[PDB]
């Protein structure tokens, strides 16, 4: 049933998954020297391209391909519209590897036809806690601990084939070539998410959305006036009132993050992310890159009291194209990013996120049920969205975990 995924070092079924007991590689160990030097053979109308992410024109070409051809909802009403500043940020973290960004262009006119991006990530991905307990009961603790050290692997994102080229087996070709370039750098595992079911996820979670400007959301048909609001004489006035927020953060001590906060934010974040089975390890340079505010892209606030940072939150912006509408071009969405709470309940920290996002003119706040995102769904009036986000590894055997054991945000 899967002519491509069946030939790959991934678990092939849930049954196979269900009997994985320790973290570790799927495949034959191999070396750099075994991997072909030359790009995979490709059709003569196409050519491989490595974009230069320091070139505005290169960023622009990837921007247009995604604007027109990246992920839509199931009803083809909204399509993500990552900005060029956002792509620069997401594709170029500290020590990114230019060769990991793989594109296919049409020779004759250099039109971008397909893209896939790999970036480095330092990931904890050793045997999960629940399996380590089982291991102890079996007498098997050393085997369970073998791959505990964080690993420098590849995070794959932004896979996109132009609509005119769909269903011609281009996506496997891109994935093979990314894999080759990554292996040529002595990296053998990757982590990726998708909103579709593939062989075979190690975790799955729901999406959640929090209305910030319900009037606009109803106008563009992101949201309905739900059926129980009909019994009311005036449905929408009641909807704004339900979703209203304070004008200003309720935590005094709340202020935008600045560069001098990098060490403290690193510490509180890493201490928190430790509680999860799969989770990134960030250097100070990586905290600076992913969390310092950047206009239009990422927004980060710390709670500082008595000169020390005790809590923080971050969210990032992605507008979506509204594919049908008359009145509105764009849905301005805020996505919960990393955070850490040590002084106040997480719900009270995130409420200030919703307040800031609303003040700065976002329409909806969005998140997946990773991290401790559940602990605040009901008080903060999030509702579940459609479908599920699935988390995957390439060349890594891994026991199924709850999404509440996952701490990697994928942009
Ligand atoms: C060590 C380093 C390893 C590095 C690599 C690690 C693996 C990275 C894996 C990539 C992680 C990406 C993470 C993200 O970015 S997920 C975001 C994916 N992008 C979108 O959904 C944007 C809109 N859609 C498209 O652009 C195209 O429909 C895509 C490109 C998705 C497929 O193109 P098309 O529709 O023209 O199809 P095809 O004929 O060329 O190919 C059909 C084959 O492709 C398999 N397929 C379909 N969708 C996905 C998908 N989302 N992940 C992996 N495989 C996918 C499918 O099951 C089939 O194989 P098999 O079922 O026949 O076997
Ligand atoms: N490789 C994936 C990256 C991803 O997992 N995302 C990227 C989306 C934007 O940052 C994020 C997301 C978060 C909250 C909600 Cl409600 C929807 C999508 C989840 C591709 C993908 C992109 C969009 C969607 Cl909906 C699902 C999957
Ligand atoms: Mg294709």
Give the length of the chain.
411
Beta bridge partners of 389: 205
Resolution (A): 1.5
- Distances in Å between the Cα of 14 and the Cα atoms of 21, 183, 328 are 13, 27, 43
Which residue reads 């750099």 in tokens?
32
Q: Total structural domains in the chain?
A: 1
3-state secondary structure (DSSP) of residue 299: strand
Q: Calculate how far, in angstroms, residue 326's C-alpha sits from the geometric centre of ligand 2.
A: 26
- Smallest CA-to-CA distance from 352 within 333, 365, 363, 370 is with 365
Closest-CA residue, ligand 1 atom 20, reads 71
User: Which residue ranges make up the annotated binding site?
Assistant: 2-5, 159, 161, 165-167, 169-171, 193
Method: X-ray
Taking the alpha carbons of 349, 352, 357, 363 in that order, is the dihedral positive or negative? positive
User: Which residue ranges make up the annotated binding site for tetradecanoyl-CoA?
Assistant: 2-5, 159, 161, 166-167, 169-171
Q: Of ligand 1's atoms, which has the minimum distance to the CA of residue 188?
A: 1
Please list, residue by residue across 195-221, b when 16 or more beta carbons sit within 10 angstroms of its beta carbon and e when fewer do: eeeebbbbbbbbbbbbbbbbebbbebe
- List residues with catalytic annotation: 411
- Smallest CA-to-CA distance from 170 within 58, 178, 60 is with 178
Beta bridge partners of 308: 305
Count other Cβ atoms within 10 Å, centred on residue 160.
21
Taking the alpha carbons of 173, 177, 180, 182 in that order, is the dihedral positive or negative? negative
Q: Of ligand 1's atoms, which has the minimum distance to the CA of residue 178?
A: 4
Which residue reads 């969390």 in tokens?
291
- Between vectors from CA 44 to CA 41 and to CA 50, what angle results, nearest 5°? 65
**Last residue before each gap in the chain (C to N over 2.5 A):** none
Q: Containing domain of residue 7, as a range?
A: 1-411
For residue 139, give the DSSP letter: T
Which residue reads 């999860």 in tokens?
276
3-state secondary structure (DSSP) of residue 360: coil
- Smallest CA-to-CA distance from 374 within 243, 195, 207 is with 207
- Distances in Å between the Cα of 386 and the Cα atoms of 180, 236, 345, 377, 402 are 35, 23, 28, 15, 18
CATH of the domain at 325: 3.40.630.170
Q: Give the mutation target among 34, 71, 179, 194 for probing the ligand 1 site: most ligand atoms within 8 A of CB.
A: 194
Ligand 1 contacts (CB < 6 A) are 2-5, 69-71, 154, 156-161, 166-172, 175, 178-179, 182-183, 187-190, 192, 194, 196, 198, 394-395
Ligand nearest to the CA of 333: 2
The answer to whether 187 touches 156, Cβ cutoff 8 Å, is no
Give the pairing type, strands 308-322 and 151-161.
Answer: unpaired
Closest-CA residue, ligand 2 atom 20, reads 194
Helix (H) or strand (E) holding 354: helix 346-359
Q: Of ligand 1's atoms, which has the minimum distance to the CA of residue 153?
A: 1
Q: Of ligand 2's atoms, which has the minimum distance to the CA of residue 316?
A: 10
User: What is the C-alpha to C-alpha distance for residues 207 and 197, in angstroms, rounded to an integer?
Assistant: 15
Beta bridge partners of 204: 390
- Smallest CA-to-CA distance from 327 within 173, 215, 241 is with 215
User: What is the C-alpha to C-alpha distance for residues 201 and 17, in angstroms, rounded to an integer?
Assistant: 9
């Amino acid at each position: 049933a899967h002519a491509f995924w069946s030939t790959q070092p991934v678990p092939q079924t849930e049954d196979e998954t269900e009997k994985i007991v320790f973290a570790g590689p799927m495949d034959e160990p191999k070396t750099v020297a075994d991997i072909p030097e030359e790009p995979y053979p490709i059709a003569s109308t196409f050519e491989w391209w490595t974009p230069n992410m320091e070139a505005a024109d290169d960023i622009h070409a990837i921007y247009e391909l995604l604007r027109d051809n990246y992920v839509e909802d199931d009803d083809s009403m909204f399509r993500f519209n990552y900005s060029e500043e956002f792509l620069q940020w997401a594709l170029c973290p500290p020590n990114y590897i230019p060769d990991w960004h793989v594109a296919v262009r049409r020779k004759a006119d250099k039109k971008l036809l397909a893209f896939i991006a790999g970036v480095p990530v330092t990931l904890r991905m050793g045997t999960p806690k629940y399996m380590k307990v089982k291991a102890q009961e079996k007498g098997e603790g050393e085997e369970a601990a073998k791959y505990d050290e964080p690993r420098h692997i590849c995070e794959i994102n932004f896979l996109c084939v132009h609509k005119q080229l769909r269903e011609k087996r281009l996506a496997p070709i891109l994935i093979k070539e990314a894999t080759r370039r990554v292996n040529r750098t002595n990296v053998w595992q990757a982590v990726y998410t998708a909103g579709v079911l593939l062989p075979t996820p190690y975790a799955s979670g729901q999406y959640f959305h929090r209305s910030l400007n319900p009037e606009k959301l109803v106008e563009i048909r992101f949201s309905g006036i739900p059926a129980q609001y009909q019994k009311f004489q005036n449905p929408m006035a009641m909807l704004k009132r339900n979703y209203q927020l304070p004008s200003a953060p309720k935590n005094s001590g709340l202020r935008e993050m600045k560069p001098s906060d990098v060490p403290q934010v690193r510490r509180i974040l890493m201490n928190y992310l430790d509680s999860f089975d799969v989770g990134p390890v960030f250097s100070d340079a990586e905290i600076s890159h992913y969390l310092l505010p950047r206009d239009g892209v990422v927004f980060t606030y710390v709670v500082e009291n008595d000169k020390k940072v005790t809590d923080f939150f971050s969210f990032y912006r992605i507008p979506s194209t509204v594919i049908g509408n008359s009145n509105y071009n764009l849905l301005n969405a805020a996505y919960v990013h990393y955070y850490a709470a040590t002084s106040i309940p997480l719900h009270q920290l995130i409420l200030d996120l919703l307040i800031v996002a609303h003040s700065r003119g976002f329409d909806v706040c969005n998140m997946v049920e990773i991290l401790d995102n559940r602990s605040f769904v009901e008080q903060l009036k999030f509702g579940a969205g459609d479908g599920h986000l699935r988390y995957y590894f390439y060349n890594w055997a891994y026991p199924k975990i709850k999404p509440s054991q996952v701490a990697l945000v994928m942009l």
